[PDB]
Amino acid sequence: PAYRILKPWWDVFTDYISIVMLMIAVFGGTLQVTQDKMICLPCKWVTKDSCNDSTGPTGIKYDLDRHQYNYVDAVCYENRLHWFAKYFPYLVLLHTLIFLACSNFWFKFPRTSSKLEHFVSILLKCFDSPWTTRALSETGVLDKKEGEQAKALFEKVKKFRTHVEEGDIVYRLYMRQTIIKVIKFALIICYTVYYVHNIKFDVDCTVDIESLTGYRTYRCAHPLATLFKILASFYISLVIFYGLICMYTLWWMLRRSLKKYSFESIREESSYSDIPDVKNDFAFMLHLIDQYDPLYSKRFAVFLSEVSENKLRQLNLN
Amino acid sequence: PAYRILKPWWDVFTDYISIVMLMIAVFGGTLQVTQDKMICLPCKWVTKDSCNDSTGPTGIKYDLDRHQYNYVDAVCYENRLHWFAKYFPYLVLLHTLIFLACSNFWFKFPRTSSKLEHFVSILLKCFDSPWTTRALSETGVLDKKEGEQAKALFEKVKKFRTHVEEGDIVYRLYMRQTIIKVIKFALIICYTVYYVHNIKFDVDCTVDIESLTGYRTYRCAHPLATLFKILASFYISLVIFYGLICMYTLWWMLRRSLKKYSFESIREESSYSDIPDVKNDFAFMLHLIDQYDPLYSKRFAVFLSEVSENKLRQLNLN
Amino acid sequence: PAYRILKPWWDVFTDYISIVMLMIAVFGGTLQVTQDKMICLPCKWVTKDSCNDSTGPTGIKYDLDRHQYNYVDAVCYENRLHWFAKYFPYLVLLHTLIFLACSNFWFKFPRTSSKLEHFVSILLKCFDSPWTTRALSETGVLDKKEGEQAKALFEKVKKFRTHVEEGDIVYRLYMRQTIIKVIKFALIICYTVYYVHNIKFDVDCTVDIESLTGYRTYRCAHPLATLFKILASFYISLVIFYGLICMYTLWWMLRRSLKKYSFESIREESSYSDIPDVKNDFAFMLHLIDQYDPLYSKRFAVFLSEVSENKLRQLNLN
Amino acid sequence: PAYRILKPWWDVFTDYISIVMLMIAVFGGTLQVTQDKMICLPCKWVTKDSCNDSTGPTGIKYDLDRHQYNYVDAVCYENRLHWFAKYFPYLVLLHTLIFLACSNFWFKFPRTSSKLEHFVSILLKCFDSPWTTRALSETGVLDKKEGEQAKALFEKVKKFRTHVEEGDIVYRLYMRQTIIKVIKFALIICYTVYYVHNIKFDVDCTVDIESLTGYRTYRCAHPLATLFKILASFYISLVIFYGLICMYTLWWMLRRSLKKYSFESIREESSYSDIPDVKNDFAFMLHLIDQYDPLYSKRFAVFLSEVSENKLRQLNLN
Amino acid sequence: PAYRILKPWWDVFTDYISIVMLMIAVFGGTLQVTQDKMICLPCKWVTKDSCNDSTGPTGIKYDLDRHQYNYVDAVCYENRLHWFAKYFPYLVLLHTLIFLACSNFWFKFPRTSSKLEHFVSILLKCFDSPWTTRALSETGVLDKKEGEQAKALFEKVKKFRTHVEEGDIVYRLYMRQTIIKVIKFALIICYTVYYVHNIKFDVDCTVDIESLTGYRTYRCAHPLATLFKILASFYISLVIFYGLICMYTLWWMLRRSLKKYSFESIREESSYSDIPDVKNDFAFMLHLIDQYDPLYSKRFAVFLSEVSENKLRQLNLN
Amino acid sequence: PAYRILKPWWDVFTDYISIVMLMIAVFGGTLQVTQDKMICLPCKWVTKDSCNDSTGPTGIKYDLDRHQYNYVDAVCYENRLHWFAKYFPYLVLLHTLIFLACSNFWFKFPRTSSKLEHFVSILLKCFDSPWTTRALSETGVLDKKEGEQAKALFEKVKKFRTHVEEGDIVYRLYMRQTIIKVIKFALIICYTVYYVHNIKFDVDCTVDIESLTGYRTYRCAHPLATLFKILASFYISLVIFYGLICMYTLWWMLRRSLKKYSFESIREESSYSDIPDVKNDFAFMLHLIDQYDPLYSKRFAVFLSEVSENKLRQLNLN
């Protein structure tokens, strides 16, 4: 509903990229569950623990029952097949979940949710005030009721300023979240690229069970290897875009030095020099709202100015 | 809810065509997943890497187990079968998603969403104003309250004009989106038509595994080839309609030269010559609203006229 | 919500018949997907490309593997089985979708949706007016506020009349939609009845593959033939009802000659002779609302009369 | 929402019984689809087209492949198995749907829906009127506004009476619906009880195919016979309850002779003798509302009385 | 929404226990449907219609086809397996449904739903009245409007008292429902505990079919026996808790003798001795609301007192 | 909706951890249901009830049918496989459910839900009062209406204080719930860690059935052992976090000694020394609201002060 203005474009993009990652994860998961197959055969002639690979033709006879193939299938799936091809989608699901948690933690966390809902309530009831457009147009009789409403609103804004000025928690939380995203990004890229090549269609496996079948080695096929490879490539691509976005966010924030809102633009333009600069934890919100729309900041700044209140006193006193 | 007036008929048609494309994609996808079968047999007599195709009859005996057929099935599915027949529906899903993204990007993007929600809020509160129908009927006592509401509304419209006049971002974004749609259209038509013919029911494949079975070549059948061919034909047809719609949109926009709203019709008809012409990024919106219903433009234009304000001053002063 | 009054009983019936058709389509579709089986056997003795059909008994031995039966199954399913039994439900789904599109096109189309939402808004705010019941009861002090509301409402109705009088698009669209429904009805009845008989339980098929099996001909069974026959009969029955409804609609509209709303009933009854007749594109709406409830037309007609306005002037002037 | 008062207890019970019938239908349907099995075997020794039923033991050898059993399965399922055991749940679904249609037709039908929504709107705005409780308490200064509201309400009720008095359609529709329910009830009981006994676990079938297998007769088993028998018993029981309810409804309506609302109770009790009796199509509604709660009828009857209006004139005139 | 105050804690617990019972029923149902397996083998040596149970080892050869095992499976499943293991979850579902029906019958039943919605509407509009807190604080100028509202509210409460005093239906219905719950509880415990032990993993069955196979007896296994046993134990435990709750409810109601609300506490405390005792069918509601929160009863009792009305007359007369 | 302020951060974390636990439970459950497989083979040479594990190679022949493998599979699954590997996910589901019950019991329980909804209603209508910000700003003409509203609000707060002061039930319930969570935590950790190691891939089982097959021992494989081991590790980790959170909660509550709200901070700061200390069952709520946001406590405390009421008397009297 109302927190769309808080979320910037980068957070919006992350929100949908997470859905796409989760989608491919769920699909790979159900695809793994429904088949989870390998197709294994023996190898009669062995050379260095591998196949030699050396009147019409006739089929070869191995003298095996259907149920022994499934046993050797399960064994060569358990032991010699590599864990990544098994557990790829579960990991992706876990990662997407903890991304989303790192994103929405500071919304769900009450200490900050209270400050944010109070801030936005103040901002909207200020923007919807009637006296603002008049004050901006001035660069003369008004209703006593809305005059008193504005008068109480000034005091509310002052108390809110005094309350928010102390905290400085939101900056720290958002900082920690971005850093967690970036380090986790790097970590997943590392082992994903390192272990992607091990997915293969064909596998030789020597499991050492003579007594049950009488064959040493086996050659096996994993049909889903190609598809999981495609999904992994698409995955790491989306991940790359996500991490570049997070790096841009981090650079923006650390560069701006944004604990202090400079504010000088409006006071020179609108000729209200008697406005102080803002302190920590109330400037960050203004920067966020500025990324959405600069208009809200200007509409809110008028109540902060004491000159506006001094003028409003004249209209109530009349 | 309220953005239905912004969307023109072509965007409406695209919205439903995307749903149809997504529907056939999901269906082909689940159909591929649940079977993903081929039925492969050997070929005893070979001529040029192909079958010679040369007391009651008797069945032929190949001396193969059930589990070897599945191995050769997986192999001839992996190697010699063509990637398009495998991965047709996934590509279609991807394309539909990126179409929808290109369509709804300028709605979800905050810099423009703010301008649009502000514009439409202004337009609706102007259309719902009581003084408009009276002003149009004039071609005399009014309430001081609604008079002051209108008076503030003029100032709001002026500030909004000054704000929107600068940007010119919406035109660029919509331009880029249409062009992306058209080039992506052409690209998908190209390889889709080039590779559709390779889907076939029957396939000969030579995989070179003598040691496991003792047969060189194999003849295989893919039942879903016909159905995927039908779906691909239906797909490219829908795509053609989509691209022709996009071309019409592009021609309309580039032809109209619409940064400047000509406006001359109302001023001659309603005898309000003292209205300036509109500049970039506020005309495009008027053209869009004109495609929906011309009435909103006329109802909104009265507040822009200074003569209307001059007359309204007389009614408030009385 | 509010467009229920626009929809007549025939459109209501079509709306639910489409749901039933879609239901049987989805069911036949999933039933086709989950089995898609035939059961094929060879035929040892052949006479004219067909079976001769000529110490306890003993089973017959064909010397075939399980995997060859599936191959010949796929072949005799692809080639000699008839396309209608395969693709019956998909066609039904397509038809139902394009029926629904032809039904809801003039609602979703913005040029007409604007006129309709404006019309119905006017009608409801007129019906909810307090002065109407008094004016009808007359066959005396009123509030100045509601008097001015009614006075502005007369002007709104006049502007709306002048706006709607020109168009004549809604009649053309509804005409085209009904005709599309009727011609498509006839087309589907034609080939459905012509090709329904080809569905059969038992099929003889000669596919000409000696090298793979050594048998010429095959006898095959399709279990779902009976069920699809039942569904097709039920389908064509529902379709017949739909088409008869559409024919009734078409006859009604072409017979009534409804561009001109005759209107003579109320003016003779309520003694308001000074009301003009209505022109194109505003009469069609009145006929539709008359099919729902004649009361709305009478309650709306009073504002159109100039005598009512002349009398209302006396009450405001007092 | 508001039509709960219209629905009597019998219609409420029918509404839930239909859901239960639909539930068992859907369950039997999916159960039929997922198995649809029979298990068929041959019979070596035949006596009168039936089985004679005449060193450790040894298994019997029939020399049949797995794929021939499925063929004879499909054949003996198609031909000799009885259609009721196949198509039981589909019929039940159809019946439940047409029951629900017969129930909700007069709600969905616009000609009557308009009358009903208008009636209930009048009744609720009368019940919520403030003057009613005072008038009942009388067995003295009031607000001019609510006085005028009541005064207009009398005229609205009079116009509504004149409008509704003519129709007499609702009685005919409800009559037809009840009769359709009762005759359809009897019909389904008839063939359901006549054909339930044919469901059996074991079946002998002689299909006459020597050339494909060399056996004349077959003995087959249908596992779901018992379960479908249980569901059919439960079905006919629920149906019996439904039909007895419908018979009670029919007897009630035909006995009461309810076109004329007798009304004599309130006029003797509350001493308002000057109220006429009610005519057709406005009494039926009062009887329905009486079945829910008699209070609404009494609260509504006061406005119908002319004495109440005569007294209200004194309070407005003061 | 508003009936949460009517429901006591025991009804709340029953509501969730029914959901848990339904959950285990649905799970056991789908588990039964998807497998419904037994695994049957013959027994070569027989002693008293049972198995005697008496160079490497070698497998035993019975000379049976795959399709005969399924036949004997179906037979030994139909005949000798016990009906409880088959139809356990369906019964549980039926019981849960009829529990829920017995719980919500007096809400859905209109004759009582009208009384309850009217009662609660009165109670809430009384609790939200402004004069109540003042009257309680008294142990002096008020608005004429709210004074008249309260004055009409007294009359409404009096009429409602006279209406509700007669009925005494709600007590009878709730009594019948509790008793049905208790007797049905006892019945299900009886046969559930009596027949639970018959579920077993291993079963010997003698079906008497020599001609089809040549074996007399069979030994069979039912894998789901253990799981259904666990579910049945959990089921009867939940059922026990449910029945003990119902017994507590029954004892409470029969002990309290609650047709007469004693009421003596408030009149001694708040010094309003001039309040009569309450009669049947209006006391039961007060007891229910007392179980939720005693405050509503006290806030409502003030309007019942005539002294409160006598005092309120002085404030309106001033 | 409104109870988000009551829930602290620890309860929030528990709420989502329960969803994750339930998710892994449902997944392990469906995974168990769909396969529930073991793959068992015999062992020809036995040494101490275990396998000795001692011209191309040839397959071994056991002379067993497909249906005997399934029998021995079911037997070795029933008897020698350990119950934990079977019933792991059901237990997890049960635990998660009873965690959620212990969490939401005091919300669903009516005796406390009434007190809480009344408390929060009072708090919100106090926070939304206009006089509070003025009273805080004072560290002078007001509307008589809101003055009387505040005056009644003081009395409401006093009655509410007297009502809540007695109970002391909420503290006991929350205490019991935390303790149940901690003891159940310890219990599940105990047997989970004790029995996790018994899950294994390979199992030897001696079932003692010579007559049916002629083999003593069997070697079996359980593919899902690894996956269930991973899920169990992840489970116990989440559980550990949950229990540490619960221990922190318990330590906080027992340490604070919170029946008495110390309150001294505001009276020294805002110079309102004439406020008493709070008693049991009204302090706990204040501590909870303090964990969310301290501002509500301060905004509410002003009405509790008698000095504020004494000052408000002057403004109403004027």
- SS3 letters for C105-139? HHHHCHHHHHHHHHHHHHHHHHHCCCHHHHHHHHC
**Architecture of the domain defined by F9-49+61-109+144-260:** Up-down Bundle (1.20)
Residues of C in Cβ contact (< 8 Å) with B223: 74, 77-78
Q: Which of B45, B97, B214 sits opposite A59 (nearest CB)?
A: B214
Which residues contact residue B164 at a Cβ distance below 8 angstroms, ignoring those fewer than 6 apart?
B115, B119, B281, B282
DSSP C202: E
Q: How many CA atoms lie within 13 A of A29 on its CB side?
A: 16
Contact F67 E41 (CB under 8 A): yes
The C-alpha atoms of residue B295 and residue C114 are separated, in whole angstroms, by 10
Structural tokens at position B284 = 């495009």
Q: Burial of D92 by CB count in 10 Å (0-12 exposed, 13-18 middle, 19+ buried)?
A: buried
Q: What b/e readout covers E267-295, taking b as 16+ CB neighbours within 10 angstroms?
A: eeebebeebeebebbbbbbbbbbebbbeb
- Is there a contact between D276 and D103 (Cβ–Cβ < 8 Å)? no
Query: Helix %, strand %, coil % for chain F, to 5?
Result: 70, 5, 25
Residues 6+ apart with CB under 8 A from F187: none
Alpha-carbon distance of C118 to C123, in angstroms, equals 9
Query: CA-CA distances (angstroms) from residue C7 to C2, C11, C106, C255, C293?
Result: 10, 6, 12, 20, 12
Can chain C be said to touch chain B, i.e. do they have 3 or more Cβ pairs within 8 angstroms?
yes
CA A284 to chain centre: 20
Say how far apart CA A78 and CA A86 lie, in whole Å.
9
- Report chain A residues whose CB lies below 8 A from the CB of F52: 211
CA-based diameter of chain A, in Å?
Answer: 118
Token code pair at residue B91: 């590509």
What backbone torsions phi and psi does residue F85 show, to the nearest 5 degrees? -65, -30
DSSP bridge partners of D221: D39, D202
What is the side-by-side strand order in the sheet with B215-221?
B39-42, B215-221, B202-209
Indicate the residue of B33, B45, B109 with minimum beta-carbon distance to A56: B45
Asked if A213 and F59 count as a contact pair (C-beta separation under 8 A), the reply is yes
* Cβ-contact A241, A235 below 8 angstroms: no
The answer to whether the CB of C4 falls within 8 A of the CB of C11 is no
Return the residue of A nearest to B110 by Cα. Answer: A292
Task: Give the Cα separation of F58 and F52 in Å (integer).
Answer: 20
For D153-172, give the DSSP string.
HHHHHHHHHHHHTT--HHHH
F-contacting chains (≥3 CB pairs under 8 Å): A, E
Chain A, chain F: beta-carbon pairs less than 8 Å apart: 90
Numbered residues of chain A with Cβ closer than 8 Å to any chain B Cβ: 4-5, 7-9, 12, 20, 31, 34, 39, 41, 43-45, 51-54, 56-62, 64, 66, 69, 130, 133-134, 136-137, 201, 219, 221, 223, 226, 230, 291-293, 295
Question: Which among D39, D64, D134 has CB closest to E71?
Answer: D39
Resolution attained, angstroms: 3.7
Comparing CA positions, the residue from F106, F96, F113 lying closest to residue F14 is F96
Neighbour count for residue B232 (Cβ, 10 Å) = 22
d(C-alpha F95, C-alpha A20), whole Å: 32
Residues of E in contact with D31 (CB under 8 A): 33
The residues near C28 (Cβ < 8 Å, ≥ 6 apart) are C88, C89, C92, C228, C231
Identify whether the C-beta of residue E217 lies closer than 8 Å to the C-beta of residue E44.
Answer: no
Contacts of F295 in chain A (CB under 8 A): 114, 118, 163
Residue F250, CA distances (Å) to A109, B34, F97, F176, F254 in order: 20, 52, 21, 10, 6
Maximum C-alpha span of chain B: 118
* DSSP-derived pairing of the beta strands F39-42 and D39-42: unpaired
Among the listed residues F61, D203, F81, F66, the one whose alpha carbon sits nearest the alpha carbon of residue E41: F66
Provide CATH code, domain B9-47+63-317: 1.20.1440.80
CB contact under 8 A, D110 and C62: no
The reply to whether residue D45 touches residue C58, judged by beta carbons under 8 angstroms, is no
Do E44 and D34 count as a contact with CB atoms less than 8 A apart? no
Residue D12, number of CB atoms within 10 A of its CB: 14
Contact A41 B212 (CB under 8 A): yes
- Residue of chain D nearest E34, judged by CA positions: D34
Q: Which residue of D has its CA nearest to E156?
A: D133
**Tokens standing for residue A72:** 């050797």
CA distances from C198 to C80, C83, C225, C228, F183 (A): 12, 10, 10, 11, 72
Work out how many CB contacts closer than 8 A connect A with B.
86
- Residue B295 distance to chain C (closest CA, Å): 9
The structure's method of determination equals: cryo-EM
Look-up: residue for tokens 């039964």?
E32
Give the closest residue to D214 by CA, choosing from D63, D50, D33.
Answer: D63
CATH superfamily of C9-48+63-317: Gap junction channel protein cysteine-rich domain (1.20.1440.80)
Q: Please state, in angstroms and rounded to a whole number, the distance separating the CA atoms of residues A65 and A70.
A: 9
Query: Which residue among F108, F159, F211 places its CB closest to the CB of E12?
Result: F108
What 8-state DSSP symbol labels residue E79? T
Residues of B with CB under 8 A from a CB of A: 33, 36, 42, 44-45, 62-68, 70-71, 74-75, 77-78, 87, 97, 108-111, 114, 152, 155-156, 159, 163, 211-216
Tokens of D91: 């019929």
Question: How far is it, in rounded angstroms, from Cα F130 to Cα F117?
Answer: 22
- Residues of chain D contacting E, Cβ within 8 Å: 4-5, 7-9, 12, 20, 31, 34, 39, 41, 43-45, 51-54, 56-62, 64, 66, 69, 130, 133-134, 136-137, 201, 219, 221, 223, 226, 230, 291-293, 295
Among residues B199, B151, F42, C173, which one has the least CA distance to residue A213?
A: F42
CA distance D175 to B223: 56
Helices A131-138 & A294-304 angle (0-180, nearest 10)? 90
Question: Which two tokens mark D305?
Answer: 């009385």
Residues of D in contact with E71 (CB under 8 A): 39, 41, 221
Could you count the other beta carbons within 10 Å of the beta carbon of residue A92?
A: 23
User: CA C156 to CA C118: how far, in whole Å?
Assistant: 11
Which residues of chain E lie closer than 8 angstroms to F70, CB-CB?
39
Question: Which tokens in the block code for residue C170?
Answer: 């809604």
The CA angle E282-E287-E290, to the nearest 5 degrees, is: 130
Q: With left for phi above 0 and alpha for psi between -120 and 50, is residue A257 left, alpha or beta?
A: left
Chain B hits for C211, Cβ within 8 Å: 43-45, 51-54
A229 CA to centre of own chain: 23
List strand residue ranges (DSSP E) for B184-230, in order: 202-209, 215-221
Q: Judge: B71–A291 Cβ closer than 8 Å, yes or no.
A: no
Q: What is the CA radius of gyration of chain A?
A: 32
C41 and C49 Cβ atoms separated by less than 8 Å: no
CATH of domain E9-51+61-317: 1.20.1440.80
Phi, psi (degrees; rounded to nearest 5) at F204: -100, 135
Q: How many CA atoms lie within 13 Å of D306's alpha carbon, on the beta-carbon side? A: 4
CB-based contact A110 F9, cutoff 8 Å:
yes
User: What is the CATH number that goes with domain D9-53+61-317?
Assistant: 1.20.1440.80
Q: How far is C227 from D33, CA to CA, in rounded Å?
A: 12
Please report all neighbours of C, defined by 3+ CB atom pairs within 8 A: B, D
Query: What tokens does A187 get?
Result: 């970590």
- Cα separation, D288 vs D11, in Å, equals 12
Of E34, E61, E69, the CB nearest to F67: E69
